[PDB]
Tab-separated table of C-alpha atoms and ligand atoms in Angstrom:
chain	number	residue	atom	x	y	z
M	1	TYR	CA	3.473	15.313	-14.539
M	2	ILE	CA	4.324	11.095	-15.861
M	3	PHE	CA	0.932	9.996	-13.249
M	4	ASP	CA	-1.448	10.788	-15.629
M	5	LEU	CA	0.727	10.352	-19.588
M	6	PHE	CA	0.338	6.062	-17.526
M	7	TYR	CA	-3.317	7.142	-17.038
M	8	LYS	CA	-3.607	7.110	-20.825
M	9	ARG	CA	-1.724	4.432	-21.577
N	1	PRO	CA	-20.015	-15.467	-5.763
N	2	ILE	CA	-19.034	-12.778	-8.404
N	3	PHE	CA	-17.180	-10.797	-6.412
N	4	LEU	CA	-14.723	-12.122	-5.045
N	5	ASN	CA	-14.507	-13.727	-8.948
N	6	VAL	CA	-13.443	-10.195	-10.377
N	7	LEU	CA	-10.495	-9.756	-6.859
N	8	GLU	CA	-8.762	-12.524	-6.860
N	9	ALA	CA	-8.942	-12.462	-11.341
N	10	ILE	CA	-7.312	-8.978	-11.355
N	11	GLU	CA	-4.853	-10.209	-7.911
N	12	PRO	CA	-1.806	-8.917	-9.074
N	13	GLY	CA	1.873	-11.544	-9.929
N	14	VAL	CA	4.796	-11.386	-8.303
N	15	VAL	CA	7.706	-8.807	-9.016
N	16	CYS	CA	10.572	-8.039	-9.214
N	17	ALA	CA	12.806	-4.843	-7.124
N	18	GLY	CA	15.530	-6.219	-9.898
N	19	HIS	CA	18.307	-6.722	-7.359
N	20	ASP	CA	22.079	-7.082	-8.102
N	21	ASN	CA	21.925	-9.116	-4.725
N	22	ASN	CA	25.870	-9.822	-4.895
N	23	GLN	CA	26.376	-6.166	-3.546
N	24	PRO	CA	26.831	-6.019	0.360
N	25	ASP	CA	23.743	-4.964	2.415
N	26	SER	CA	24.508	-0.523	1.471
N	27	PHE	CA	21.517	1.630	2.326
N	28	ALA	CA	22.067	3.074	-1.166
N	29	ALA	CA	21.510	-0.635	-3.162
N	30	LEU	CA	19.442	-1.798	-0.845
N	31	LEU	CA	17.122	1.872	-1.310
N	32	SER	CA	17.391	2.482	-4.273
N	33	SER	CA	15.933	-0.902	-5.496
N	34	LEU	CA	12.921	0.122	-3.586
N	35	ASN	CA	11.905	3.174	-5.701
N	36	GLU	CA	12.059	0.014	-7.638
N	37	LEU	CA	9.660	-1.824	-6.355
N	38	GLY	CA	7.700	0.749	-4.938
N	39	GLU	CA	7.800	2.149	-8.818
N	40	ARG	CA	7.080	-1.434	-9.949
N	41	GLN	CA	4.979	-2.292	-7.976
N	42	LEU	CA	2.619	1.221	-8.487
N	43	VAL	CA	2.960	0.785	-12.441
N	44	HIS	CA	0.273	-2.854	-11.655
N	45	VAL	CA	-1.954	-0.933	-9.399
N	46	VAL	CA	-2.820	1.021	-11.079
N	47	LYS	CA	-3.163	-1.595	-13.840
N	48	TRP	CA	-5.518	-3.609	-11.502
N	49	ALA	CA	-7.615	-1.288	-10.124
N	50	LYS	CA	-8.322	0.512	-13.488
N	51	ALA	CA	-9.667	-3.534	-13.166
N	52	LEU	CA	-11.393	-3.148	-10.109
N	53	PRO	CA	-15.888	-3.735	-8.994
N	54	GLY	CA	-16.661	0.128	-10.382
N	55	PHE	CA	-13.796	1.707	-9.868
N	56	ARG	CA	-13.972	3.248	-13.838
N	57	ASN	CA	-18.114	4.533	-12.132
N	58	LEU	CA	-15.527	7.047	-9.822
N	59	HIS	CA	-14.227	10.556	-11.899
N	60	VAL	CA	-10.438	10.238	-13.360
N	61	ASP	CA	-8.716	12.946	-11.565
N	62	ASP	CA	-10.830	11.125	-8.846
N	63	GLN	CA	-9.349	7.908	-9.433
N	64	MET	CA	-5.710	8.620	-9.886
N	65	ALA	CA	-5.889	10.850	-6.779
N	66	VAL	CA	-6.885	7.675	-4.931
N	67	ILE	CA	-4.629	5.755	-6.519
N	68	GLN	CA	-1.717	7.920	-5.731
N	69	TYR	CA	-2.501	8.275	-2.311
N	70	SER	CA	-3.534	4.547	-1.204
N	71	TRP	CA	-0.190	3.381	-2.932
N	72	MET	CA	2.291	3.119	0.201
N	73	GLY	CA	-0.695	1.757	2.183
N	74	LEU	CA	-1.892	-1.306	-0.599
N	75	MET	CA	1.769	-2.340	-1.110
N	76	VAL	CA	2.116	-2.157	3.001
N	77	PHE	CA	-0.545	-4.669	3.495
N	78	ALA	CA	-0.238	-7.036	0.319
N	79	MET	CA	3.544	-7.702	0.792
N	80	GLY	CA	2.608	-8.126	5.170
N	81	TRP	CA	0.662	-11.451	3.313
N	82	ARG	CA	3.867	-11.923	0.978
N	83	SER	CA	5.953	-12.048	4.693
N	84	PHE	CA	2.786	-13.702	5.789
N	85	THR	CA	2.297	-16.360	3.185
N	86	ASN	CA	6.189	-16.747	1.960
N	87	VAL	CA	8.585	-16.500	5.096
N	88	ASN	CA	6.277	-17.541	7.593
N	89	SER	CA	6.328	-13.857	8.971
N	90	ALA	CA	10.093	-14.232	9.561
N	91	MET	CA	11.460	-11.814	7.130
N	92	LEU	CA	10.159	-9.279	4.865
N	93	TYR	CA	9.061	-10.182	1.438
N	94	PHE	CA	9.775	-6.820	-0.572
N	95	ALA	CA	9.600	-9.424	-3.728
N	96	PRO	CA	11.513	-12.594	-4.545
N	97	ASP	CA	14.940	-11.043	-5.259
N	98	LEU	CA	14.458	-7.950	-2.172
N	99	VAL	CA	14.197	-10.163	0.561
N	100	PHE	CA	14.310	-8.195	4.454
N	101	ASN	CA	16.421	-9.160	7.008
N	102	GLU	CA	17.575	-8.139	10.465
N	103	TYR	CA	20.691	-7.255	9.305
N	104	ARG	CA	19.252	-5.649	6.036
N	105	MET	CA	16.051	-4.353	8.378
N	106	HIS	CA	18.598	-2.303	10.044
N	107	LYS	CA	20.871	-1.647	6.739
N	108	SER	CA	17.888	0.301	5.255
N	109	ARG	CA	18.077	2.885	7.988
N	110	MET	CA	14.118	1.502	8.080
N	111	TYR	CA	14.069	-0.491	10.975
N	112	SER	CA	10.948	1.038	13.334
N	113	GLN	CA	9.165	1.283	9.690
N	114	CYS	CA	10.018	-2.771	9.800
N	115	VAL	CA	9.519	-3.905	13.134
N	116	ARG	CA	5.834	-2.365	12.672
N	117	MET	CA	5.634	-4.698	8.600
N	118	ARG	CA	7.518	-7.556	10.031
N	119	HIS	CA	4.609	-7.018	12.412
N	120	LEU	CA	1.167	-6.879	11.241
N	121	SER	CA	2.084	-9.694	8.480
N	122	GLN	CA	2.416	-11.799	12.117
N	123	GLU	CA	-0.343	-10.884	12.528
N	124	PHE	CA	-2.010	-11.935	9.252
N	125	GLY	CA	-1.063	-14.903	11.496
N	126	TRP	CA	-2.385	-14.458	14.635
N	127	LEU	CA	-5.432	-14.528	13.193
N	128	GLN	CA	-6.244	-16.324	10.475
N	129	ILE	CA	-6.429	-14.798	8.377
N	130	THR	CA	-7.901	-15.889	4.701
N	131	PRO	CA	-7.128	-15.145	1.031
N	132	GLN	CA	-10.822	-13.689	0.790
N	133	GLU	CA	-10.128	-11.667	3.291
N	134	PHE	CA	-6.771	-10.224	2.003
N	135	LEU	CA	-8.208	-10.091	-1.093
N	136	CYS	CA	-11.442	-7.775	0.147
N	137	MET	CA	-8.768	-5.826	2.614
N	138	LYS	CA	-6.546	-4.295	0.005
N	139	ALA	CA	-8.898	-3.006	-2.607
N	140	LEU	CA	-11.369	-1.658	0.717
N	141	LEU	CA	-7.333	0.198	1.508
N	142	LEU	CA	-7.521	2.126	-1.379
N	143	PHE	CA	-10.848	3.804	-0.152
N	144	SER	CA	-9.420	4.175	3.353
N	145	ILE	CA	-6.749	7.505	1.940
N	146	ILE	CA	-9.074	10.983	1.215
N	147	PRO	CA	-8.452	15.209	0.595
N	148	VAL	CA	-10.240	16.757	3.723
N	149	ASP	CA	-11.776	19.657	0.599
N	150	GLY	CA	-13.541	16.588	-0.820
N	151	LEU	CA	-13.592	14.152	-3.764
N	152	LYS	CA	-14.529	15.354	-7.034
N	153	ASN	CA	-16.771	13.492	-7.115
N	154	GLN	CA	-17.585	12.217	-2.875
N	155	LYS	CA	-20.784	11.395	-3.382
N	156	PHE	CA	-20.293	8.254	-6.000
N	157	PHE	CA	-17.227	7.682	-4.145
N	158	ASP	CA	-18.838	6.999	-0.709
N	159	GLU	CA	-21.188	5.317	-2.581
N	160	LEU	CA	-17.665	2.736	-4.176
N	161	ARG	CA	-16.201	1.992	-0.373
N	162	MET	CA	-19.761	1.478	1.576
N	163	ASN	CA	-20.181	-1.543	-1.455
N	164	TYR	CA	-16.722	-2.614	-0.466
N	165	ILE	CA	-17.466	-3.006	3.662
N	166	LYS	CA	-21.122	-4.849	2.880
N	167	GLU	CA	-18.959	-7.524	0.389
N	168	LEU	CA	-16.231	-7.113	2.966
N	169	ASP	CA	-18.802	-7.895	5.637
N	170	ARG	CA	-21.225	-10.418	3.201
N	171	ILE	CA	-17.099	-12.150	3.198
N	172	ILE	CA	-16.922	-13.128	6.505
N	173	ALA	CA	-21.159	-13.075	7.405
N	174	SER	CA	-21.654	-12.957	16.552
N	175	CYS	CA	-19.459	-12.179	12.871
N	176	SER	CA	-19.052	-9.039	14.759
N	177	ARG	CA	-16.131	-10.475	16.260
N	178	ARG	CA	-14.391	-11.088	13.511
N	179	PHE	CA	-15.596	-7.701	11.899
N	180	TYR	CA	-13.892	-5.340	14.420
N	181	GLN	CA	-10.127	-7.115	14.331
N	182	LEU	CA	-10.327	-6.559	10.810
N	183	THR	CA	-11.193	-2.836	11.157
N	184	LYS	CA	-8.323	-3.046	13.201
N	185	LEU	CA	-5.676	-4.391	10.595
N	186	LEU	CA	-7.112	-2.718	8.227
N	187	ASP	CA	-6.398	0.838	9.996
N	188	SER	CA	-2.833	-0.037	11.771
N	189	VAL	CA	-1.903	0.554	8.158
N	190	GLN	CA	-2.198	4.139	7.788
N	191	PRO	CA	0.057	4.385	10.980
N	192	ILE	CA	2.475	2.986	9.326
N	193	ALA	CA	1.861	3.656	5.372
N	194	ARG	CA	3.123	7.308	6.771
N	195	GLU	CA	6.029	6.635	8.305
N	196	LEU	CA	6.758	5.068	5.103
N	197	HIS	CA	5.608	7.525	3.509
N	198	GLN	CA	7.416	10.325	5.632
N	199	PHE	CA	10.620	8.455	5.325
N	200	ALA	CA	10.549	8.267	1.726
N	201	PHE	CA	9.796	11.809	1.692
N	202	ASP	CA	12.763	12.601	3.947
N	203	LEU	CA	14.537	10.811	1.200
N	204	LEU	CA	13.861	12.017	-1.330
N	205	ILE	CA	15.211	15.654	-0.396
N	206	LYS	CA	17.931	14.372	0.754
N	207	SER	CA	18.680	11.900	-1.789
N	208	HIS	CA	20.676	14.143	-3.590
N	209	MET	CA	23.841	13.060	-0.824
N	210	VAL	CA	22.891	9.755	0.237
N	211	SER	CA	23.091	8.778	-3.128
N	212	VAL	CA	20.010	6.647	-3.301
N	213	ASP	CA	18.054	6.900	-7.149
N	214	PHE	CA	14.774	7.701	-7.305
N	215	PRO	CA	12.639	6.998	-10.847
N	216	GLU	CA	11.152	9.853	-12.619
N	217	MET	CA	7.759	8.368	-11.426
N	218	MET	CA	8.828	7.955	-7.518
N	219	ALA	CA	9.942	11.804	-7.386
N	220	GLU	CA	6.784	13.476	-8.058
N	221	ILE	CA	4.482	11.091	-6.446
N	222	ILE	CA	6.098	11.527	-2.909
N	223	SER	CA	6.808	15.831	-4.733
N	224	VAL	CA	3.876	17.014	-5.032
N	225	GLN	CA	0.272	13.647	-3.448
N	226	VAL	CA	2.525	12.262	-0.182
N	227	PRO	CA	3.521	16.372	0.996
N	228	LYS	CA	0.070	17.064	0.052
N	229	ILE	CA	-1.238	13.386	2.971
N	230	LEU	CA	2.052	14.709	4.976
N	231	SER	CA	0.246	18.822	5.491
N	232	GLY	CA	-3.077	17.209	6.719
N	233	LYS	CA	-4.795	18.172	3.157
N	234	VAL	CA	-4.906	15.009	2.574
N	235	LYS	CA	-6.585	12.123	4.941
N	236	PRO	CA	-7.281	8.010	5.820
N	237	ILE	CA	-10.862	7.329	7.403
N	238	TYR	CA	-9.619	4.953	10.200
N	239	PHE	CA	-12.681	3.240	11.080
N	240	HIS	CA	-12.519	3.462	14.939
N	241	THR	CA	-11.095	6.730	16.904
N	242	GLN	CA	-7.661	6.736	16.955
B	301	LIG	C1	10.396	5.113	-2.699
B	301	LIG	C2	10.052	4.055	-1.149
B	301	LIG	C3	11.590	4.275	-0.288
B	301	LIG	O1	11.414	3.433	-1.254
B	301	LIG	C4	9.158	2.768	-1.122
B	301	LIG	O2	7.569	3.299	-0.993
B	301	LIG	N1	9.689	1.981	-0.521
B	301	LIG	C5	8.676	0.749	-0.207
B	301	LIG	C6	9.289	0.247	-1.497
B	301	LIG	C7	7.913	-1.406	-2.060
B	301	LIG	C8	7.357	-1.975	-0.821
B	301	LIG	N2	6.752	-3.352	-1.323
B	301	LIG	O3	5.759	-3.506	-0.824
B	301	LIG	O4	7.415	-3.591	-2.541
B	301	LIG	C9	7.518	-0.654	-0.102
B	301	LIG	C10	6.076	-1.063	1.268
B	301	LIG	F1	4.834	-1.055	0.806
B	301	LIG	F2	6.587	-2.501	1.852
B	301	LIG	F3	6.775	-0.776	2.427
B	301	LIG	C11	7.585	0.011	0.277
């Protein structure tokens, strides 16, 4: 979800 | 002294709970701040870990995984130094704007767990824990919990963790006397971590009804990764058994 997104910013 | 130069150079700053300190100590308001604090302090682990000596050595899924699990244990450990260093261990120094008093300890309904945290905070004291000793134990804490099926590459991981002991082992180095104590403390962490992990999870389910606000990412980690731990899928690596 939203953690893996935080892992490309 | 290169290893150390790094832990401190990467070492986060002071995160604020962003808390309306005017509102009286309500179970909802208190915990709707801790949730943001969880969130904010999580962002900061995300960034801190990314910069660890050979962190990008690990698998990217493993990287996320280890952070997702450790997150808590770290926040607790760091928080206890925060309390120890800033309040001499009198209260629980979560953020500048969220210091926990007996009454706040009681009002969040987290009293037992706080007794635990004031406790381990008290330990930094009773054990004359150096900052270079604290920093090292905290880095190492990231490598203190795994899934039981193992990581996408356990190999490259075990490698990592093993060299984070030799490091703390070098930072210590009749040294064995000290060693034990520190590995002991580093264990006291997980028991507590798991208690908040349980507290947090209970909350998430009933948050709909106790009016306590979880950020999107907070709920997700608690909804999808924390259960893994609670269900015994993911277990922490203790030094001594226990
Ligand atoms: C989301 C849940 C209840 O708030 C939670 O883990 N609380 C929380 C929040 C922040 C911090 N912190 O270190 O600043 C901690 C704790 F690590 F002390 F336990 C717990």
